[PDB]
Design a protein around this motif. Sequence first.
Motif, PDB file in Angstrom:
ATOM      1  N   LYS A 158      61.378   5.108  39.107  1.00 56.70           N
ATOM      2  CA  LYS A 158      62.623   4.533  39.624  1.00 56.70           C
ATOM      3  C   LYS A 158      62.360   3.208  40.332  1.00 56.70           C
ATOM      4  O   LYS A 158      61.227   2.910  40.721  1.00 56.70           O
ATOM      5  CB  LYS A 158      63.329   5.528  40.549  1.00 56.70           C
TER       6      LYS A 158
ATOM      7  N   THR B  22      66.803   4.752  37.369  1.00 54.57           N
ATOM      8  CA  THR B  22      65.549   4.735  36.606  1.00 54.57           C
ATOM      9  C   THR B  22      65.394   3.395  35.878  1.00 54.57           C
ATOM     10  O   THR B  22      66.257   2.521  35.992  1.00 54.57           O
ATOM     11  CB  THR B  22      65.501   5.895  35.584  1.00 54.57           C
TER      12      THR B  22
ATOM     13  N   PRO C 279      68.150  10.694  31.897  1.00 52.56           N
ATOM     14  CA  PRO C 279      67.697   9.809  32.973  1.00 52.56           C
ATOM     15  C   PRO C 279      68.816   8.913  33.512  1.00 52.56           C
ATOM     16  O   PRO C 279      69.568   8.321  32.734  1.00 52.56           O
ATOM     17  CB  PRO C 279      66.606   8.981  32.298  1.00 52.56           C
TER      18      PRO C 279
END
Lengths: 177, 79, 66, 115
Positions: free
Chosen positions: B68, B37, B7
Amino acid sequence: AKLHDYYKDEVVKKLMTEFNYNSVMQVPRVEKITLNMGVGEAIADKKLLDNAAADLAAISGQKPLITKARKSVAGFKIRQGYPIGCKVTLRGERMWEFFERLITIAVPRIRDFRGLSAKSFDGRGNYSMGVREQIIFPEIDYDKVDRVRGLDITITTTAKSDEEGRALLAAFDFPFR
Amino acid sequence: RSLKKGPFIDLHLLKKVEKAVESGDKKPLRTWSRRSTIFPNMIGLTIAVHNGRQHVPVFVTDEMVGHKLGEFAPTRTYR
Amino acid sequence: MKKDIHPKYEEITASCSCGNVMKIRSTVGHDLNLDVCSKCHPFFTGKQRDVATGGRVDRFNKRFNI
Amino acid sequence: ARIAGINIPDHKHAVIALTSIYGVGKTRSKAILAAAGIAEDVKISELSEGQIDTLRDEVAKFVVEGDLRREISMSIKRLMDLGCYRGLRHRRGLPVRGQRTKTNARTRKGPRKPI
RNA sequence: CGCGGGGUGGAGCAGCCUGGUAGCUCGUCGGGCUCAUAACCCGAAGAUCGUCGGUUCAAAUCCGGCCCCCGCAACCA
RNA sequence: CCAGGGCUACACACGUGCUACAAUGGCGCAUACAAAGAGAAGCGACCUCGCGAGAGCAAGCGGACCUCAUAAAGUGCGUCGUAGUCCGGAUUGGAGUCUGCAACUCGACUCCAUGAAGUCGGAAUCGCUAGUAAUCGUGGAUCAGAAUGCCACGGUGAAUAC
RNA sequence: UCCUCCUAAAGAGUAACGGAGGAGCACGAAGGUUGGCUAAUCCUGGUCGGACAUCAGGAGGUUAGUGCAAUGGCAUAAGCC
Ligand SMILES: [Mg+2]
Ligand SMILES: [Mg+2]
Ligand SMILES: [Mg+2]
Ligand SMILES: [Mg+2]
Ligand SMILES: [Mg+2]
Ligand SMILES: [Mg+2]
Ligand SMILES: [Mg+2]
Ligand SMILES: [Mg+2]
Ligand SMILES: [Mg+2]
Ligand SMILES: [Mg+2]
Ligand SMILES: [Mg+2]
Ligand SMILES: [Mg+2]
Ligand SMILES: [Mg+2]
Ligand SMILES: [Mg+2]
Ligand SMILES: [Mg+2]
Ligand SMILES: [Mg+2]
Ligand SMILES: [Mg+2]
Ligand SMILES: [Mg+2]
Ligand SMILES: [Mg+2]
Ligand SMILES: [Mg+2]
Ligand SMILES: [Mg+2]
Ligand SMILES: [Mg+2]
Ligand SMILES: [Mg+2]
Ligand SMILES: [Mg+2]
Ligand SMILES: [Mg+2]
Ligand SMILES: [Mg+2]
Ligand SMILES: [Mg+2]
Ligand SMILES: [Mg+2]
Ligand SMILES: [Mg+2]
Ligand SMILES: [Mg+2]
Ligand SMILES: [Mg+2]
Ligand SMILES: [Mg+2]
Ligand SMILES: [Mg+2]
Ligand SMILES: [Mg+2]
Ligand SMILES: [Mg+2]
Ligand SMILES: [Mg+2]
Ligand SMILES: [Mg+2]
Ligand SMILES: [Mg+2]
Ligand SMILES: [Mg+2]
Ligand SMILES: [Mg+2]
Ligand SMILES: [Mg+2]
Ligand SMILES: [Mg+2]
Ligand SMILES: [Mg+2]
Ligand SMILES: [Mg+2]
Ligand SMILES: [Mg+2]
Ligand SMILES: [Mg+2]
Ligand SMILES: [Mg+2]
Ligand SMILES: [Mg+2]
Ligand SMILES: [Mg+2]
Ligand SMILES: [Mg+2]
Ligand SMILES: [Mg+2]
Ligand SMILES: [Mg+2]
Ligand SMILES: [Mg+2]
Ligand SMILES: [Mg+2]
Ligand SMILES: [Mg+2]
Ligand SMILES: [Mg+2]
Ligand SMILES: [Mg+2]
Ligand SMILES: [Mg+2]
Ligand SMILES: [Mg+2]
Ligand SMILES: [Mg+2]
Ligand SMILES: [Mg+2]
Ligand SMILES: [Mg+2]
Ligand SMILES: [Mg+2]
Ligand SMILES: [Mg+2]
Ligand SMILES: [Mg+2]
Ligand SMILES: [Mg+2]
């Protein structure tokens, strides 16, 4: 039949220890079950009532009473002495027979089931259920009915506080939230 | 949604959060990285995401993780 | 009860797929078949499985793992 | 013909019978009958009760009907409580997957209105 | 002040004096045709009925007050 | 010069498409017939891991050779039998995939569940005179990725012109 | 013309172009009688169902009802069955 014998022996003795009742008659007992079916749409179609009466007559053992409208009102377009709904006030032997058939097999067949309302008391131990479908009871054939109609069950007791009346129903292994 | 290879957060926001978390709670972080994120360590911080003309404060909760930062900053105003 | 006006309230045998045989009395006919009963319905496990669904932080850790 | 919550079809093939269950479609239904060991060409009228009980335990593995309906309702209701872009999209009644909202979007927005 | 009659989409009229679901002709709005506008064709919205009240199960429609409007009377000495 | 945001907004109105509303059709298994392209930070076999997008290893080809590349309509059997349907395949939730510093505003595709309107369209009105209309594939250009557009290609193949 | 209330001064009666309302019927069950019954309006719970249709219990007790005005009257019920 069996739940009345179960009540007499097993339940009372369980309820005696909870609220230290001085007498056996002090225990709350289930007086009657009143199955109600306010069809309502019988204003337009007269037979639609007689369809509901047959379905109540199938669900319960006995035949229903066609209840007249108490007063005339403009909101629904109804008048004095017009057949608006159907009812059954079954009690005694067939009542315990129905009460088993309700909680043991029918209540499980409710669609999207989870847990029945614990708050649902009148403040005097008198419970009520509201079934959406007629199909939940196994008496109705699947290719006979043609309407999303249902009834409401109404368990009457000799209790005095909903707190007292909850334990009675809870003693029959009744599903609460 | 995309990206299985870790991520994604911008280096600057990662270092700014790590510096903010170790010290303690303070004030809204002026950040423009919407693309980034939200990590588990970002919970508690009231970081201010750039909607386009101004910074919108967003108190990060337990649910705001996989999402996000730009999701909690409506760009186009309407009515 | 008033005889003649009511329908036939005969005894019948309920038998679900679980194995719980159970005689009752109702206006159906010959025999019965059921899916579930007071026993075998998932409400005691249902509430355990339904309530413990949430969990967002561990889901993130299961992807990244570092 | 009474598995899961509802499932009551008749004069319909076993694969197409289980499509009527909420949470079971075309390919899932083939996986049910493959695991159950039942032919797809037969219908529920042709089947016996001994075979229907195996279908009940097989669909119990997957999340279906009221279990699934709440799982979807939770996920939509979650998004709206967060106040994310998708949550604002949902409650406003507008398309979510980055769609055109100017000409079309009639499915989500509903039918036409006056000006 | 006296006795008739009225007050209904934006306009003019029905439905109102026999209480149960409000039409007509125009205009407004949307689309057509046309180079464009009109005409024309095709759909659509738009009135809780002067208001305050009573009667009724329910009032545009029944009954009473008030608020306007319109006619007829307002005479003999 | 830079970070984001926007050009993708949304009571509505039209244009041009595409996919439909099915039975000359829908989904499965047996398998036959094209052309025109295109490719070196390229196009990327066969193998193996994948339910699939794809993931590895990597053969070959600056090409009549090697590759994207099984054309689909079409047969042949099966099964559904006129149902908002095994029609439509929208929309939503979840789980992903590649590209790419980065996929939420705002990508494409995949899987799973979901299964909206729609039962041939008011006044109007458009194109088309033969390999043409009609229908089924297919390619390329722009292009990291992103066509239902555009530009090309070939299948079956009509009616009618007094 | 007929009925009800007030004016009408605690029996009856009592006027005015005094003050307010009704009637020109209705019903073979809305009569007879026998045997039963009890209301309004809320509260809380309950499928669709919501303030209100139908059900359950609790509250109030004649605010109800009386074929039609108003008056007097009715649980012994003249009320509703
Ligand atoms: Mg604003
Ligand atoms: Mg599918
Ligand atoms: Mg599939
Ligand atoms: Mg899309
Ligand atoms: Mg958009
Ligand atoms: Mg007018
Ligand atoms: Mg009318
Ligand atoms: Mg007009
Ligand atoms: Mg109209
Ligand atoms: Mg208005
Ligand atoms: Mg009346
Ligand atoms: Mg009247
Ligand atoms: Mg009216
Ligand atoms: Mg009328
Ligand atoms: Mg543009
Ligand atoms: Mg787009
Ligand atoms: Mg507006
Ligand atoms: Mg249009
Ligand atoms: Mg299909
Ligand atoms: Mg198709
Ligand atoms: Mg070449
Ligand atoms: Mg090859
Ligand atoms: Mg292979
Ligand atoms: Mg697959
Ligand atoms: Mg990769
Ligand atoms: Mg490869
Ligand atoms: Mg060579
Ligand atoms: Mg070779
Ligand atoms: Mg290709
Ligand atoms: Mg080959
Ligand atoms: Mg291939
Ligand atoms: Mg091959
Ligand atoms: Mg085919
Ligand atoms: Mg349907
Ligand atoms: Mg339809
Ligand atoms: Mg789909
Ligand atoms: Mg469907
Ligand atoms: Mg059809
Ligand atoms: Mg057509
Ligand atoms: Mg056609
Ligand atoms: Mg034309
Ligand atoms: Mg033409
Ligand atoms: Mg020509
Ligand atoms: Mg096609
Ligand atoms: Mg294709
Ligand atoms: Mg193409
Ligand atoms: Mg290319
Ligand atoms: Mg194309
Ligand atoms: Mg195309
Ligand atoms: Mg006289
Ligand atoms: Mg007096
Ligand atoms: Mg007197
Ligand atoms: Mg006197
Ligand atoms: Mg006196
Ligand atoms: Mg005298
Ligand atoms: Mg006198
Ligand atoms: Mg007098
Ligand atoms: Mg008079
Ligand atoms: Mg007689
Ligand atoms: Mg009588
Ligand atoms: Mg009598
Ligand atoms: Mg007798
Ligand atoms: Mg009597
Ligand atoms: Mg009274
Ligand atoms: Mg009185
Ligand atoms: Mg009577």
